[PDB]
RNA sequence: UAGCGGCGAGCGAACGGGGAGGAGCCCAGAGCCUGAAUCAGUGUGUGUGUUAGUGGAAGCGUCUGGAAAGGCGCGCGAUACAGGGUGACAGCCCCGUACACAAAAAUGCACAUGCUGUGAGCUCGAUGAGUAGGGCGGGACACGUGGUAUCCUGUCUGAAUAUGGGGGGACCAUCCUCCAAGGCUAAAUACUCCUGACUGACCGAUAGUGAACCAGUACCGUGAGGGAAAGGCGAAAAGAACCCCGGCGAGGGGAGUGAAAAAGAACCUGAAACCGUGUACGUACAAGCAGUGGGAGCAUGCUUAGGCGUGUGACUGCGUACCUUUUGUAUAAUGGGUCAGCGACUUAUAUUCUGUAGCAAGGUUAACCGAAUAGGGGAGCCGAAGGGAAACCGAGUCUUAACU
């Protein structure tokens, strides 16, 4: 039988052109007033997954 | 390009079908795959599940001075188990059309260099009789052969069933292993024309 | 060539690692899997994305977006595979016969992938600004 | 394709039990015990090719030291005497000459006395 | 994949395509006209098949051996060289095989077709109420009540019934599409206790069924139930008449049979552990993983007028087994009485990476159709383009009012 994708991971990562994955930053859901604007601005755009935790992502979603 | 032995007619055959470099690996792979396809692969041992016997522990976990057992059927016991029991499986393996054609083009061109390929005009026995076919190969100086024919005659077919070292395949039904196995290959001018078009 | 004389290409075959066959094998006694622990055990090893009970990367990061319904039924036609249909007419049903785009694709777009020669009148199809220069430079008039 | 392994195993055990030939009790008879003895024999064999070179040097040196002191010189001074006269002859031969040809040997102790 | 999901573990569609196989009808009823085309009788009829079967080709001589099918040399049938037996390996000795043929009698099929028996036609109307739907509670849908369409229902209720009603995934309105609340339907599909044939990169007596053998037997259990072990003399019994020791025993020695009887039934081969009998050397003042380097003598094999093999090993330097597990084991930590046999990284499909072969901006088919490892069949898949949450734009695009 075929491999099943870890769907939760499929809803948190997207495959870029090279091979790496874009993901949304943590710490931008609630408790925002105490955080500085500079943080919240820097956390807004998407970000690339680090080379340490890339193998864990590549395993859990083998399709795309 | 291929002279005959009772005519000397210039049958101009295509260059890149009957005149190529012998790719050994491709041919090897195709003949190995063809061989692997010949398997039926019918066999089965029975796992510790499938053996007849109870699930019961014969003796308990502790207490007695004896190695902890859990089943009569366990593969380390006698008369029960076979750890990795075989299941009936299909050993046939995929061969790419272009690889199969390429291997045929490779082997069928090597027969021209080795002089196994004896191209001929009309090849057919008079009546459905082995005695005549066996007698006519004496003049042709042949023994272990693959008589390929476009128009497959029943008269010729029936007359080569009992002959072991002779085989009579149709021009459509050439094989990788057959072309290599037999010591000569006798192709009819029509069969060369059909095989030329088939391999292309 | 005989049925015996055939042999494979060097490097094609590689035998295979056979675990638990003496010292001389190299791997043998603990078949390349060390001493004890969960990973040494038969049917061992943790599941995917398991970081020792720490909250995994695929759960500590937030989930984003929504899968579009329209994106599933729209194609990106390569301009290289443009003049392979019916002379110089590429509506939709004509393009579908040439097996360039899938059956359930109503919307489709011609991007600048390079190389056109023949004039192609692109009807009933969305065209890119770079492809609009190319298609017209080749000859054909869009819409 | 089931592979019986009675022919090959026997040949493996029988090979080692041939090397164990001469050992005491089980060590010759019983594979499980013999195999250890045959390995140990190998380890000791490997070791003792090193010690053979040591022992014999001592054996020679003792003979030379014995034969030198008959003529009234000690080994330590004798070898220095030979070295200082650029004599290249080894212990092995000095020991052989010491036993066999003493009238010859005596000349080396004089040759050493010069230095 | 879309979704579902303590949005965890996991579970997982349809539209849509390519195939296999294709087939439709009866009722909730009134005219003329009529039994007709449909199911099924039951014949009888080919055609069969299945359950008995018949014929079925052509070798000889020497050599070795117990025996010839063997080697050697010459023949011959082959639509028969599948396979088996036969005193060793048989195309031609025998049984088969290809092929050619069979049925008194019973039956399983496919068409004529006499028929107790059954309605072809257009009609004219009908067109399935405690029902659809709703509330409550459960369930089935990939879909866990969620924004939840859909279906079924335990419970309580209730339309319109073609000017009508269902559906198109909360819902509404427009369009499209169907017609619920009754039935019946071959094929493609699943399976094999069982009957045949035929095939194995299946096993070959600790294997293969538990069971090659009088095995679901012996034996165990109150019982449900569990459940063994145990194959082979030889070509042919020619299975040892007769003597001799012995208890007119066992058991032997003969003699005989055979090619062979250490093939004599406790019967091919006959390993190892283990237990012996005889020959050579060593061994009763000598301390320990029992070996290992040195090494006299003695005994045999050889070539000899040197010594070199082989068995033995006085005496002597060094030397605390193996495995496991450990920071670390001679350890007084684990495991092993020994031998023989068996006993542990496998198999299937997905996936990424390395090698290798094909062809190359292409590569490539899946089921299937082929009797067929050909060749079709590109439905698909993957790649050649990405950015964005997405519409959308695209060698750019996102961000942003706009970006050095
Ligand atoms: Mg937010
Ligand atoms: Mg801050
Ligand atoms: Mg601030
Ligand atoms: Mg602040
Ligand atoms: Mg995919
Ligand atoms: Mg069971
Ligand atoms: Mg149980
Ligand atoms: Mg129980
Ligand atoms: Mg105990
Ligand atoms: Mg014990
Ligand atoms: Mg058994
Ligand atoms: Mg078994
Ligand atoms: Mg087993
Ligand atoms: Mg397989
Ligand atoms: Mg495989
Ligand atoms: Mg295949
Ligand atoms: Mg194919
Ligand atoms: Mg041959
Ligand atoms: Mg064929
Ligand atoms: Mg190699
Ligand atoms: Mg190798
Ligand atoms: Mg191999
Ligand atoms: Mg393998
Ligand atoms: Mg292995
Ligand atoms: Mg290694
Ligand atoms: Mg190692
Ligand atoms: Mg490893
Ligand atoms: Mg371990
Ligand atoms: Mg540990
Ligand atoms: Mg570990
Ligand atoms: Mg396990
Ligand atoms: Mg597990
Ligand atoms: Mg959300
Ligand atoms: Mg397509
Ligand atoms: Mg595509
Ligand atoms: Mg490009
Ligand atoms: Mg075998
Ligand atoms: Mg064994
Ligand atoms: Mg043995
Ligand atoms: Mg041998
Ligand atoms: Mg061993
Ligand atoms: Mg032996
Ligand atoms: Mg010795
Ligand atoms: Mg000794
Ligand atoms: Mg022994
Ligand atoms: Mg012995
Ligand atoms: Mg030295
Ligand atoms: Mg896809
Ligand atoms: Mg939903
Ligand atoms: Mg919850
Ligand atoms: Mg949500
Ligand atoms: Mg849909
Ligand atoms: Mg469809
Ligand atoms: Mg479908
Ligand atoms: Mg369709
Ligand atoms: Mg079928
Ligand atoms: Mg059909
Ligand atoms: Mg069809
Ligand atoms: Mg019909
Ligand atoms: Mg029909
Ligand atoms: Mg009909
Ligand atoms: Mg009759
Ligand atoms: Mg009949
Ligand atoms: Mg008939
Ligand atoms: Mg008949
Ligand atoms: Mg019959
Ligand atoms: Mg018959
Ligand atoms: Mg006959
Ligand atoms: Mg004869
Ligand atoms: Mg003779
Ligand atoms: Mg004779
Ligand atoms: Mg005789
Ligand atoms: Mg003969
Ligand atoms: Mg004869
Ligand atoms: Mg003669
Ligand atoms: Mg001759
Ligand atoms: Mg001859
Ligand atoms: Mg034959
Ligand atoms: Mg035969
Ligand atoms: Mg045959
Ligand atoms: Mg014999
Ligand atoms: Mg025989
Ligand atoms: Mg033979
Ligand atoms: Mg013969
Ligand atoms: Mg035969
Ligand atoms: Mg013959
Ligand atoms: Mg012959
Ligand atoms: Mg017949
Ligand atoms: Mg007749
Ligand atoms: Mg008759
Ligand atoms: Mg008949
Ligand atoms: Mg008859
Ligand atoms: Mg008949
Ligand atoms: Mg009759
Ligand atoms: Mg009769
Ligand atoms: Mg009859
Ligand atoms: Mg009858
Ligand atoms: Mg009406
Ligand atoms: Mg109706
Ligand atoms: Mg109606
Ligand atoms: Mg109705
Ligand atoms: Mg009513
Ligand atoms: Mg009513
Ligand atoms: Mg409804
Ligand atoms: Mg409603
Ligand atoms: Mg409704
Ligand atoms: Mg209801
Ligand atoms: Mg309410
Ligand atoms: Mg409800
Ligand atoms: Mg559920
Ligand atoms: Mg819930
Ligand atoms: Mg549910
Ligand atoms: Mg519910
Ligand atoms: Mg709600
Ligand atoms: Mg939920
Ligand atoms: Mg939700
Ligand atoms: Mg919600
Ligand atoms: Mg609705
Ligand atoms: Mg509702
Ligand atoms: Mg439903
Ligand atoms: Mg319903
Ligand atoms: Mg009312
Ligand atoms: Mg009303
Ligand atoms: Mg009504
Ligand atoms: Mg009314
Ligand atoms: Mg409606
Ligand atoms: Mg509705
Ligand atoms: Mg639906
Ligand atoms: Mg309209
Ligand atoms: Mg209903
Ligand atoms: Mg109905
Ligand atoms: Mg009814
Ligand atoms: Mg029908
Ligand atoms: Mg069947
Ligand atoms: Mg075997
Ligand atoms: Mg076998
Ligand atoms: Mg047995
Ligand atoms: Mg046996
Ligand atoms: Mg058995
Ligand atoms: Mg046995
Ligand atoms: Mg059993
Ligand atoms: Mg019995
Ligand atoms: Mg009882
Ligand atoms: Mg029991
Ligand atoms: Mg019991
Ligand atoms: Mg037994
Ligand atoms: Mg017997
Ligand atoms: Mg017999
Ligand atoms: Mg026999
Ligand atoms: Mg016999
Ligand atoms: Mg007798
Ligand atoms: Mg007497
Ligand atoms: Mg008595
Ligand atoms: Mg008496
Ligand atoms: Mg008497
Ligand atoms: Mg007796
Ligand atoms: Mg007697
Ligand atoms: Mg006797
Ligand atoms: Mg006699
Ligand atoms: Mg005799
Ligand atoms: Mg005789
Ligand atoms: Mg003999
Ligand atoms: Mg004899
Ligand atoms: Mg005799
Ligand atoms: Mg005898
Ligand atoms: Mg005799
Ligand atoms: Mg014997
Ligand atoms: Mg014998
Ligand atoms: Mg006797
Ligand atoms: Mg007897
Ligand atoms: Mg007895
Ligand atoms: Mg017996
Ligand atoms: Mg016995
Ligand atoms: Mg025999
Ligand atoms: Mg024997
Ligand atoms: Mg014996
Ligand atoms: Mg015997
Ligand atoms: Mg023996
Ligand atoms: Mg023995
Ligand atoms: Mg022995
Ligand atoms: Mg013993
Ligand atoms: Mg004794
Ligand atoms: Mg003895
Ligand atoms: Mg004795
Ligand atoms: Mg003595
Ligand atoms: Mg003393
Ligand atoms: Mg003494
Ligand atoms: Mg002692
Ligand atoms: Mg001491
Ligand atoms: Mg000591
Ligand atoms: Mg020694
Ligand atoms: Mg020595
Ligand atoms: Mg001597
Ligand atoms: Mg000592
Ligand atoms: Mg010491
Ligand atoms: Mg020691
Ligand atoms: Mg030590
Ligand atoms: Mg431990
Ligand atoms: Mg400790
Ligand atoms: Mg110890
Ligand atoms: Mg130590
Ligand atoms: Mg202890
Ligand atoms: Mg303890
Ligand atoms: Mg211990
Ligand atoms: Mg341990
Ligand atoms: Mg412990
Ligand atoms: Mg242990
Ligand atoms: Mg113990
Ligand atoms: Mg063993
Ligand atoms: Mg076993
Ligand atoms: Mg593995
Ligand atoms: Mg790659
Ligand atoms: Mg690569
Ligand atoms: Mg490479
Ligand atoms: Mg390569
Ligand atoms: Mg290229
Ligand atoms: Mg078919
Ligand atoms: Mg055909
Ligand atoms: Mg045919
Ligand atoms: Mg087939
Ligand atoms: Mg695709
Ligand atoms: Mg490019
Ligand atoms: Mg993208
Ligand atoms: Mg894109
Ligand atoms: Mg823009
Ligand atoms: Mg925007
Ligand atoms: Mg913008
Ligand atoms: Mg902008
Ligand atoms: Mg601005
Ligand atoms: Mg700007």
Q: Give ∠ CA D34-D40-D43 in degrees, rounded to 5.
A: 150
**Whole-angstrom Cα distance, residue B110 to residue B112?**
5
Q: Positive or negative, the Cα torsion across D73, D76, D82, D88?
A: positive
Chain A residues whose beta carbon lies within 8 Å of the beta carbon of residue C59: 8
C7 touching B (Cβ < 8 Å): yes
DSSP-derived pairing of the beta strands B166-167 and B145-148: parallel
Q: Do B24 and C6 touch (CB under 8 A)?
A: yes
Measure D19 CA to ligand 6 centroid, in angstroms: 49
Residue C28, CA atoms < 13 Å, CB-side half-sphere = 7
Give the range of the structural domain holding residue A38, as residue numbers without chain letter.
1-64
Q: Is residue A29 within 8 Å of residue A21, measured between CB atoms?
A: no
CB of C6 less than 8 A from some CB of B: yes
User: In whole angstroms, what is the distance from residue D19 CA to residue D12 CA?
Assistant: 11
Q: What is the CATH number of the domain that holds C121?
A: 3.100.10.10
The chains found to touch D (3+ Cβ pairs under 8 angstroms) are: none
How far apart (Å, rounded) are the C-alpha atoms in residues B126 and B160?
A: 13
Give 3-state DSSP helix, strand, coil % of chain B, rounded to 5.
Answer: 35, 10, 55
Q: How many Å does it take to go from CA B89 to C1' E20? A: 24
Q: Is C92 exposed, middle or buried (0-12, 13-18, 19+ CB in 10 A)?
A: middle
Expt. technique: cryo-EM
Verify B-A touch: 3 or more CB pairs within 8 A.
no
Distance C62 CA to ligand 113 centre (A): 30
User: Which candidate, D51, D60, D47, places its Cα nearest to that of D90?
Assistant: D60
List, in sequence order, every beta strand (DSSP E) within C8-127: 74-78, 107-111, 126-127
Give strand letter and number of the nucleotide nearest C110 (CA to C1'). Answer: E394
CB-based contact, B24 to chain C, within 8 Å? yes
Euclidean distance between CA atoms C54 and C75, whole angstroms: 42
- CB distance C61–A60 less than 8 Å? no
Record the tokens describing residue B155, joined without a space. Answer: 């008269």
Sheet holding C74-78, edge to edge: C74-78, C107-111, C126-127
Calculate the angstrom distance between C1' of E75 and CA of B126.
Answer: 25
- Give the closest of C1, C7, C9 to B107, CB-based: C1
Work out if A48's Cβ lies within 7 angstroms of strand E. Answer: no
Q: Is the CB of B152 under 7 A from strand E?
A: no
Whether C42 contacts chain B with CB within 8 A: no
A53·C57 Cβ contact <8 A: yes
In angstroms, the CA B113 to CA B110 distance is 5
Strand E near-CB residues (< 7 Å), D 69-88: none
From C4's Cα to the closest Cα of chain B, the distance in A is 10
Tokens 């040759």, located at residue: D111
C55 touches chain B (CB under 8 A): no
Q: How far B94 CA lies from chain C's nearest CA (Å)?
A: 17
Interface test with C, best of B20, B23, B28, B84 (most C CBs within 10 A): B28
Rounded Cα–Cα distance for residues A16 and D81 (Å): 86
Question: In terms of C-beta density within 10 A (0-12 exposed, 13-18 middle, 19 or more buried), how is residue C116 classed?
Answer: buried
Give the experimental resolution in Å: 3.0
CA distances from D27 to A25, D37, D46 (A): 72, 6, 20
Domains contained in chain A, number: 1
Q: How far is the CA of C69 from the centre of ligand 54 (A)?
A: 21
Between residue 82 and residue 101 of chain C, the positions with Cβ below 7 Å from nucleic chain E are 99
State which residues between 23 and 52 of chain C bring their CB within 7 Å of strand E: 29-31, 33, 35-36, 47-49
CB distance D80 to D114 below 8 Å: no
B143/B166 Cα distance (integer angstroms): 7
Which residue range is the domain that position C136 belongs to? 71-142
Beta-sheet pairing, A21-23 with C74-78? unpaired
C57–A11 CB contact, under 8 Å = no
CA dihedral sign of residues A29, A32, A35, A38: positive
B25 and C9 in contact by Cβ < 8 A?
yes
User: Phi-psi category of C45—alpha, beta or left, where left has phi over 0 and alpha has psi -120 to 50?
Assistant: left
- Interchain pair A12, C49: CB under 8 A: no
The span from the CA of B73 to the CA of B71, in Å, is 5
Strand E reaches within 7 A of the B90 CB: yes
Q: Does C24 touch chain A (CB under 8 A)?
A: no
């Amino acid at each position: 039988p075929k491999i099943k994708t870890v769907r939760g991971a499929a809803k948190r990562f997207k495959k870029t052109g090279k091979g790496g994955f874009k993901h949304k930053h943590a710490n931008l859901r609630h408790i925002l007033t105490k955080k500085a604007t500079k943080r919240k601005r820097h956390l807004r755009p998407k970000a690339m997954v680090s080379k340490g935790d890339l193998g864990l992502v590549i395993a859990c979603l083998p399709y795309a | 390009e291929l002279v005959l032995k009772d005519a000397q007619s210039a049958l101009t055959v295509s260059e890149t079908t009957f005149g190529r470099d012998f790719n050994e690996a491709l041919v090897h792979q195709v003949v190995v795959a063809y061989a692997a396809g010949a398997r039926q692969g019918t066999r089965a041992q029975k796992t510790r599940a499938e053996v007849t016997g109870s699930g019961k522990k014969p003796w308990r976990q502790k207490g007695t001075g004896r190695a902890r057992s859990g089943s009569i059927k366990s593969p380390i016991w006698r008369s029960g188990g076979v750890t990795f029991a075989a299941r009936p499986q299909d050993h046939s393996q995929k061969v790419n059309k272009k690889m199969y054609r390429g291997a045929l083009k490779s082997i069928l061109s090597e027969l021209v260099r080795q002089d196994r390929l004896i191209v001929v005009e009309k090849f057919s026995v008079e009546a459905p009789k082995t005695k005549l076919l066996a007698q006519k190969l004496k003049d042709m100086a042949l023994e272990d052969v693959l008589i390929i024919t476009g128009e497959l005659d029943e008269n010729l077919f029936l007359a080569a069933r009992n002959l072991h070292k002779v085989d009579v395949r149709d021009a459509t039904g050439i094989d990788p292993v057959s072309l290599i196995a037999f010591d000569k290959v006798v192709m009819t001018a029509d069969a060369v024309k059909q095989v030329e078009e088939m391999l292309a | 060539m005989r049925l015996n004389t055939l042999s494979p290409a060097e490097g094609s075959k590689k035998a295979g690692k056979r675990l638990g066959r003496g010292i001389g094998s190299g791997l043998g006694k603990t078949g390349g899997r060390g001493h004890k622990g969960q990973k040494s055990r038969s049917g061992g090893g943790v599941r995917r994305g398991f970081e020792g009970g720490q909250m995994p990367l695929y759960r500590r990061l937030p989930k984003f977006g929504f899968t579009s319904r329209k994106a599933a039924i729209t194609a990106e036609i390569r301009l290289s595979d443009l003049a392979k249909v019916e002379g110089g007419v590429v509506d939709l049903n004509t393009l579908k016969a040439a097996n360039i785009i899938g059956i359930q694709i109503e919307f489709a777009k011609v991007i600048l992938a390079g190389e056109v020669t023949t004039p192609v009148t692109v009807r009933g199809l969305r065209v890119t600004k770079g492809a609009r220069a190319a298609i017209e430079a080749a000859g054909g008039k869009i819409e | 394709a089931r592979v019986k392994r009675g022919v090959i195993a026997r040949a493996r055990h029988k090979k080692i039990l041939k090397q164990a030939k001469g050992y005491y009790g089980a060590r010759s008879r019983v594979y499980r015990v013999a195999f250890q003895a045959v390995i140990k024999a190998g380890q000791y064999a490997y070791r003792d090719r090193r010690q053979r070179k040591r022992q014999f040097r001592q054996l020679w040196i003792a003979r030379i030291n014995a034969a030198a002191r008959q003529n009234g010189i000690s080994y330590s001074k004798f070898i220095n005497g030979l070295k200082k006269a650029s004599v290249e002859i080894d212990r092995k031969i000095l020991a052989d000459i010491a036993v066999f040809d003493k009238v010859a040997f005596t000349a080396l102790v004089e040759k050493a006395k010069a230095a």
